[PDB]
Amino acid sequence: PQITLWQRPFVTVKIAGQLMEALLDTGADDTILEEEMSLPGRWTPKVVGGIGGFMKVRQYDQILVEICGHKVIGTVLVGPTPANIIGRNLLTQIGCTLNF
Amino acid sequence: PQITLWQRPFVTVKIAGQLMEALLDTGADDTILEEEMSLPGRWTPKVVGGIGGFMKVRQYDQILVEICGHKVIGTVLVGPTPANIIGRNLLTQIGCTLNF
Numbered sequence: 001p002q003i004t005l006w007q008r009p010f011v012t013v014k015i016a017g018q019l020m021e022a023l024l025d026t027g028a029d030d031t032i033l034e035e036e037m038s039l040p041g042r043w044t045p046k047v048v049g050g051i052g053g054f055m056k057v058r059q060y061d062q063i064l065v066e067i068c069g070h071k072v073i074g075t076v077l078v079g080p081t082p083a084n085i086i087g088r089n090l091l092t093q094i095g096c097t098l099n100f
Numbered sequence: 101p102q103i104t105l106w107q108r109p110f111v112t113v114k115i116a117g118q119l120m121e122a123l124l125d126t127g128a129d130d131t132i133l134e135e136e137m138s139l140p141g142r143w144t145p146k147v148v149g150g151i152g153g154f155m156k157v158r159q160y161d162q163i164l165v166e167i168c169g170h171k172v173i174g175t176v177l178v179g180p181t182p183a184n185i186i187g188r189n190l191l192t193q194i195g196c197t198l199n200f
């Protein structure tokens with residue numbers, strides 16, 4: 001699909017049996033999910049930086065994400081983000097481009 | 101142009117005679133510029149929220165921004181952001197879409 005930007009670009013996403021809306025975020029290197037997200041497995045501690053400073057996150061590798069039905073696999077970060085965010089690591093896998 | 105997302109989507113912008121690179125940022129409602137940007141005129145205090153918390157910014161209305169040569173006008177926020185950010189308030193004015 002082609003999506004305009006008068007509304008926040010939320011899509012429905014399915015990760016490990018859970019459903020959620022997430023922001024298609026061209027300004028984000030990495031994908032980050034809300035703190036209530038429960039993902040199984042090992043993870044490595046990491047910290048992510050943004051507007052307002054830094055925040056601590058769990059890094060989960062090789063997670064299957066279904067974004068508008070497209071299946072993608074990549075690293076997902078979990079932590080106290082205000083919004084589920086799909087970053088360029090996953091956006092590249094769905095052939096996402098900016099057009100203007 | 102059509103732009104892929106294997107690299108951060110920076111464009112060259114020109115704002116009140118100054119040049120800078122700014123991130124085309126679909127996850128941003130608002131446009132924000134680095135703390136050293138000098139904009140003339142009055143402004144109103146505002147605070148912006150993100151990953152890591154909140155930050156204080158100056159809100160300047162009706163600023164002329166030249167983005168890849170498109171002329172647009174909108175509210176620009178200035179404050180201690182780690183990256184110049186073009187948000188959907190200006191992205192909609194350059195006919196910017198997401199495509200996948």
Ligand SMILES: CCOP(=O)(COc1ccc(C[C@H](NC(=O)O[C@H]2CO[C@H]3OCC[C@H]32)[C@H](O)CN(CC(C)C)S(=O)(=O)c2ccc(OC)cc2)cc1)OCC
Binds near residue numbers: 029126149
């Ligand atoms: C305190 C709660 O306030 P909030 O209003 C903010 O909810 C957010 C937060 C962050 C983002 C993504 C970033 N946009 C954003 O900050 O926008 C600002 C300006 O406009 C406003 O729109 C909502 C957020 C304001 C931006 O697109 C991505 N990076 C920021 C910047 C460095 C580009 S990032 O999120 O810090 C990031 C992601 C992945 C990374 O990989 C390592 C690194 C960094 C979206 C929504 O809650 C709403 C319910």
